[PDB]
Amino acid sequence: NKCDVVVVGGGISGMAAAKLLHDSGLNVVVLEARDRVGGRTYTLRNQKVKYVDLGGSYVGPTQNRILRLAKELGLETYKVNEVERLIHHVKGKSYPFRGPFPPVWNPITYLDHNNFWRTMDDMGREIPSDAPWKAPLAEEWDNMTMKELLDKLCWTESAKQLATLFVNLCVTAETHEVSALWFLWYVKQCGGTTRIISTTNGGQERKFVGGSGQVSERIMDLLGDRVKLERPVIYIDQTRENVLVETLNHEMYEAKYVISAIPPTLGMKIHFNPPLPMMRNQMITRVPLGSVIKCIVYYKEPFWRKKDYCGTMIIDGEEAPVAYTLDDTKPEGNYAAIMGFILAHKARKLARLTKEERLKKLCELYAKVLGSLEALEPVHYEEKNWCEEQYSGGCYTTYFPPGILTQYGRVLRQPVDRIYFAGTETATHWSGHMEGAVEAGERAAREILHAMGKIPEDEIWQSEPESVDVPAQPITTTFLERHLPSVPGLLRLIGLTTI
Amino acid sequence: NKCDVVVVGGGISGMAAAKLLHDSGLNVVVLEARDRVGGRTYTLRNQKVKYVDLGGSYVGPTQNRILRLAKELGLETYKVNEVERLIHHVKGKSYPFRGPFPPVWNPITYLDHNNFWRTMDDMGREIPSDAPWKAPLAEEWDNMTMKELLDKLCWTESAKQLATLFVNLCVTAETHEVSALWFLWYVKQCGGTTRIISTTNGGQERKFVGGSGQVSERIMDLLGDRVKLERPVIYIDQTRENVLVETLNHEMYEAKYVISAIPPTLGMKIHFNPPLPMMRNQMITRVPLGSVIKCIVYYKEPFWRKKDYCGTMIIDGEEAPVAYTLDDTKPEGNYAAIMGFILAHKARKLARLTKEERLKKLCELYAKVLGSLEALEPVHYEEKNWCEEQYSGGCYTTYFPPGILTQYGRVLRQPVDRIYFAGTETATHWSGHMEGAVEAGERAAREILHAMGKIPEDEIWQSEPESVDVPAQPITTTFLERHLPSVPGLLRLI
Numbered sequence: 003n004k005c006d007v008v009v010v011g012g013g014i015s016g017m018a019a020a021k022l023l024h025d026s027g028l029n030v031v032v033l034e035a036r037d038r039v040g041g042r043t044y045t046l047r048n049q050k051v052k053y054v055d056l057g058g059s060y061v062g063p064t065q066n067r068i069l070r071l072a073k074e075l076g077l078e079t080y081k082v083n084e085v086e087r088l089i090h091h092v093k094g095k096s097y098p099f100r101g102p103f104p105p106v107w108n109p110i111t112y113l114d115h116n117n118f119w120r121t122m123d124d125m126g127r128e129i130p131s132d133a134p135w136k137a138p139l140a141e142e143w144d145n146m147t148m149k150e151l152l153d154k155l156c157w158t159e160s161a162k163q164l165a166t167l168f169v170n171l172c173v174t175a176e177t178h179e180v181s182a183l184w185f186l187w188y189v190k191q192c193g194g195t196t197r198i199i200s201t202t203n204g205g206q207e208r209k210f211v212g213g214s215g216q217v218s219e220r221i222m223d224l225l226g227d228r229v230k231l232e233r234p235v236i237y238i239d240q241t242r243e244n245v246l247v248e249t250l251n252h253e254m255y256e257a258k259y260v261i262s263a264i265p266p267t268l269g270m271k272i273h274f275n276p277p278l279p280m281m282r283n284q285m286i287t288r289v290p291l292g293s294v295i296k297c298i299v300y301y302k303e304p305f306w307r308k309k310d311y312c313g314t315m316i317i318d319g320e321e322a323p324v325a326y327t328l329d330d331t332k333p334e335g336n337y338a339a340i341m342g343f344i345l346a347h348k349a350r351k352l353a354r355l356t357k358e359e360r361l362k363k364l365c366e367l368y369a370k371v372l373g374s375l376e377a378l379e380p381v382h383y384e385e386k387n388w389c390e391e392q393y394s395g396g397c398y399t400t401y402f403p404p405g406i407l408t409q410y411g412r413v414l415r416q417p418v419d420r421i422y423f424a425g426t427e428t429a430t431h432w433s434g435h436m437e438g439a440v441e442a443g444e445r446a447a448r449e450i451l452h453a454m455g456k457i458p459e460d461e462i463w464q465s466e467p468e469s470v471d472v473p474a475q476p477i478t479t480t481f482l483e484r485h486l487p488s489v490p491g492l493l494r495l496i497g498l499t500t501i
Numbered sequence: 502n503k504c505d506v507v508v509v510g511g512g513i514s515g516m517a518a519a520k521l522l523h524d525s526g527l528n529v530v531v532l533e534a535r536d537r538v539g540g541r542t543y544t545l546r547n548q549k550v551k552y553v554d555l556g557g558s559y560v561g562p563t564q565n566r567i568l569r570l571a572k573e574l575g576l577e578t579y580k581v582n583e584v585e586r587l588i589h590h591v592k593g594k595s596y597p598f599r600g601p602f603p604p605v606w607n608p609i610t611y612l613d614h615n616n617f618w619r620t621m622d623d624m625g626r627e628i629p630s631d632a633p634w635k636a637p638l639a640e641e642w643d644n645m646t647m648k649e650l651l652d653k654l655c656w657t658e659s660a661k662q663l664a665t666l667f668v669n670l671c672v673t674a675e676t677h678e679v680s681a682l683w684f685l686w687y688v689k690q691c692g693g694t695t696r697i698i699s700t701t702n703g704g705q706e707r708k709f710v711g712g713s714g715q716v717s718e719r720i721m722d723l724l725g726d727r728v729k730l731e732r733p734v735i736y737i738d739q740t741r742e743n744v745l746v747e748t749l750n751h752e753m754y755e756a757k758y759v760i761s762a763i764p765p766t767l768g769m770k771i772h773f774n775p776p777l778p779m780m781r782n783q784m785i786t787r788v789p790l791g792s793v794i795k796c797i798v799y800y801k802e803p804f805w806r807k808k809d810y811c812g813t814m815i816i817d818g819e820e821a822p823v824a825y826t827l828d829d830t831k832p833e834g835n836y837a838a839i840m841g842f843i844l845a846h847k848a849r850k851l852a853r854l855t856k857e858e859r860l861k862k863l864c865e866l867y868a869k870v871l872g873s874l875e876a877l878e879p880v881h882y883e884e885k886n887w888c889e890e891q892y893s894g895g896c897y898t899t900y901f902p903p904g905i906l907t908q909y910g911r912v913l914r915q916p917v918d919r920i921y922f923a924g925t926e927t928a929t930h931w932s933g934h935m936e937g938a939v940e941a942g943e944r945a946a947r948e949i950l951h952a953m954g955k956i957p958e959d960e961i962w963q964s965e966p967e968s969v970d971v972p973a974q975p976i977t978t979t980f981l982e983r984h985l986p987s988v989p990g991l992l993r994l995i
């Protein structure tokens with residue numbers, strides 16, 4: 003019944019919030035809908051895989067909050083394998099490469115590719131991380147989809163195709179589904195195009211030894227019986243002196259404050275008294291999560307390494323069920339595995355199939371891409387379709403369709419009386435990621451500490467010292483990358499010389 | 502506790518479903534979240550207005566189901582005033598006109614306007630009403646917004662501005678918010694551009710004497726204590742022999758079948774056991790409702806009629822809080838009033854203001870557009886911001902953002918075990934309207950009758966005889982309207 007703060011949701015954000023509050027001496031309760039904590043993180047354990055992350059998994063440089071929290075919990079990271087060559091598979095052919103990005107040889111195509119990424123980052127610099135709706139061209143950019151932006155910027159199909167895959171992979175949505183302003187904000191607040199996408203020096207550099215689910219689990223261990231599992235919140239009443247929070251199994255909790263640490267749209271599952279203010283009421287119907295099946299195919303050995311492939315495949319084309327893979331082999335070199343994402347519309351399309359049918363399709367794809375018959379001999383398979391989850395709504399995160407972020411973005415983390423808002427979606431750095439979950443959980447907790455008069459206003463948002471274990475190299479450009487013209491730029495230079 | 506069918510939602514669709522089932526001899530219970538029935542319809546009564554529709558109000562030709570149901574309930578309609586001239590107000594100036602549509606004089610502009618509406622209807626003919634995702638170009642049209650389509654088709658700013666207002670008014674959303682495929686389907690399934698937008702011979706021809714709220718109210722009267730008010734459904738369990746439906750006030754209902762007669766996204770307010778199938782689970786997060794404040798300003802007299810204006814104003818431009826009005830005066834000629842809609846982003850923008858501030862802005866706008874100081878002297882004001890409604894989500898209806906209808910549209914009315922889906926959103930004719938609410942409620946009820954073996958499969962979908970009281974005139978085109986070239990067409994001919 004009675005406590006200081008009810009935290010709705012026991013994912014990383016809710017758990018990080020509860021831990022901060024608990025450490026500060028408050029009585030906290032975590033109400034978790036599922037029979038488990040972790041939410042969009044889920045580490046499955048069995049003898050065949052030992053452990054496997056079926057949800058969020060990767061951490062990297064500049065994600066200092068999750069790294070600190072995980073380290074404090076006694077967790078270690080290891081590096082995702084990127085020793086050997088990456089593969090870019092396009093028009094039925096594999097092109098192995100080193101360095102972070104697929105090489106482009108055609109001079110015009112090179113100009114187009116260079117300009118596109120540059121322009122994405124250029125536009126991003128005009129977008130405040132904490133207020134994307136304040137960008138000078140916010141309305142213009144919000145009123146077009148990423149598809150329209152690609153159509154305008156990409157003068158080659160090659161660039162347009164790679165850019166599309168980039169969007170699909172980053173936010174598990176189609177280019178036509180998402181606002182350009184939102185996507186540009188999303189990339190920028192993850193440190194830019196290079197940082198968001200890279201393995202070495204980027205968001206995918208590392209995984210936790212033992213799985214990411216240990217973050218939430220070990221916090222639950224610390225909190226003990228303060229975490230209530232199988233307590234979906236159905237009702238929040240703020241009409242009386244103390245906030246009343248009711249669960250589906252007919253329990254009532256009474257608190258001074260509430261943190262909502264659930265995906266924004268899942269706020270819809272709660273009936274509010276009094277009703278939410280108009281802007282939030284409508285916002286939570288406007289913010290879907292993306293669509294993904296995360297699939298892990300196990301093999302006797304990491305055979306791709308013998309062919310000087312690290313296991314990273316960037317796979318273009320409608321026929322390919324999986325557009326991106328990473329080596330998921332354990333740091334010890336055993337439980338050899340390829341992790342692949344079935345993205346956006348393909349998650350919808352292929353969900354109809356059986357698990358065995360999806361396995362077959364993946365193996366046949368990998369055999370082609372790796373040029374290896376061994377890919378047809380899996381020893382085990384695990385998958386998770388996040389679209390089916392009632393208490394997630396999707397993965398990885400919430401996307402904003404055209405027009406929504408400028409109209410409703412302001413209210414995402416605006417408190418509603420005594421309800422404060424956590425969740426990765428409310429983060430200003432690495433939103434959509436485990437890192438953002440930590441930032442948002444701890445910020446929301448500190449908003450409550452400030453409301454209680456326990457800390458000053460300037461302590462609500464707190465900077466994080468850089469990890470000593472995972473230092474960040476800066477993202478650099480060359481002179482040529484900076485100043486090479488776009489395709490229309492080159493054409494204007496031709497026009498002026500001809501005239 | 503125990504009944505044959507639980508209907509979730511006591512709007513027109515839920516009520517029409519419950520009435521059909523009740524009339525067939527089944528024991529029905531209606532679980533309604535609010536302390537009233539009617540949902541997106543709401544008729545307020547007081548001495549100042551007598552009655553006023555603050556939600557859905559208008560009915561017209563080809564809406565034969567709502568007309569039949571209302572007539573059976575003892576309701577009558579009257580005609581919205583369109584005797585005198587309509588006004589098109591653009592770039593700060595009022596252009597009175599007769600006939601249904603604002604005249605365009607510039608030849609190039611005329612060609613562009615003519616082509617646009619014609620193209621909208623041409624495209625709609627390729628969109629199956631019962632399966633828009635089966636349109637030949639479904640993906641192409643679904644993957645662009647209405648803004649992109651208008652940008653492609655409209656060679657004049659004049660056409661683009663009127664087309665934008667048309668979209669804003671029809672679906673209370675911005676052109677950039679909505680899928681082109683969905684919007685083209687929406688218009689087509691209301692009988693086309695002329696039918697959806699027209700007062701005389703269209704969707705806005707008539708209102709119910711006494712208010713539209715009477716449809717739901719009178720069905721509640723028939724059903725008596727079978728209607729449970731202030732029973733928001735929170736939980737549906739289909740794991741056992743009978744379906745279990747739980748409400749917020751801790752009541753449990755047990756039924757053979759359930760009809761969900763709530764806006765699709767409001768399905769999110771219910772926790773499901775077992776979980777919903779993946780496609781519906783995600784669909785109900787992808788389908789918002791539009792944004793509108795419906796405002797009615799009352800005057801001593803319908804003074805605009807004296808200036809030979811009917812009260813219809815089509816008002817372009819960002820500064821105007823209200824883009825569209827109709828005369829809301831009673832058939833008797835008293836309680837003179839102008840009904841206006843504050844649409845889409847303007848509903849969001851102006852919601853910050855006080856009721857009094859909104860009244861002032863509307864009166865000043867109407868004074869300008871009507872060229873009448875009398876507009877500055879209101880005697881009363883009523884308004885409703887549908888964006889604030891927990892158990893509606895918005896008005897008038899659900900819109901589909903780009904990419905959604907083709908990917909998820911199939912599951913909108915697909916049964917989930919013993920749950921069948923009503924609500925205007927699931928209609929195939931006049932979806933988004935009170936007519937669609939009736940169609941969907943009666944169809945969902947008949948799906949359950951068929952599942953019980955009471956009626957054959959071919960009786961699930963039932964045709965409706967035309968109203969004798971509100972007959973439909975056909976929508977016609979002229980030879981020139983049909984064959985005049987577009988702007989690019991004229992350029993190719995040059």
Ligand SMILES: *[C]C1=C([C])[C]=[C@@]23C(=[C]1)N([C][C]([O])[C]([O])[C]([O])[C]OP([O])(=O)OP([O])(=O)O[C][C]1O[C](N4[C]=NC5=C4N=[C]N=C5[N])[C]([O])[C]1[O])C1=NC(=O)[N]C(=O)C1=N2C3#C[C][N][C]1[C][C]C2=C1[C]=[C][C]=[C]2
Pocket residue numbers: 010011012013014015016033034035036038039040041042043056057058059060061171172173198199200205206233234235236263264265268271272294295296326388393394396397398399424425426427433434435436437439
């Ligand atoms: C799913 C997923 C996947 C598959 C993958 C991934 C992911 C995911 N991600 C994301 C993450 O995970 C997230 O962000 C997190 O986790 C979040 O957190 P939060 O905020 O906390 O949330 P959640 O988890 O959801 O939680 C919540 C909770 O609550 C609950 N509930 C609900 N409702 C309710 C409740 N309770 C009570 N009551 C009520 N009513 C639930 O149950 C839960 O528990 C990620 N992230 C990171 O960081 N990393 C990673 O890795 C991940 N993953 C991904 C990724 C991807 N990546 C890719 C590759 C390449 C690239 C990319 C991207 C970009 C660029 C490049």
Ligand SMILES: *[C]C1=C([C])[C]=[C@@]23C(=[C]1)N([C][C]([O])[C]([O])[C]([O])[C]OP([O])(=O)OP([O])(=O)O[C][C]1O[C](N4[C]=NC5=C4N=[C]N=C5[N])[C]([O])[C]1[O])C1=NC(=O)[N]C(=O)C1=N2C3#C[C][N][C]1[C][C]C2=C1[C]=[C][C]=[C]2
Pocket residue numbers: 509510511512513514515532533534535537538539540541542555556557558559560670671672697698699704705732733734735762763764767770771793794795825887892893895896897898923924925926933934935936938
């Ligand atoms: C709001 C509105 C307005 C302002 C206006 C209008 C409208 C609206 N509309 C629409 C209508 O109203 C609709 O459609 C109907 O009503 C619907 O129905 P239904 O389907 O049945 O639905 P609702 O109502 O919503 O109901 C539901 C119910 O449920 C309940 N819930 C929820 N949740 C829950 C519950 N319960 C239990 N549990 C749970 N959880 C609720 O509460 C409710 O009750 C319309 N329509 C028609 O027809 N008419 C009219 O007039 C209308 N309005 C509008 C219109 C406009 N118009 C415009 C002018 C010119 C033009 C236009 C358009 C187009 C073209 C042209």
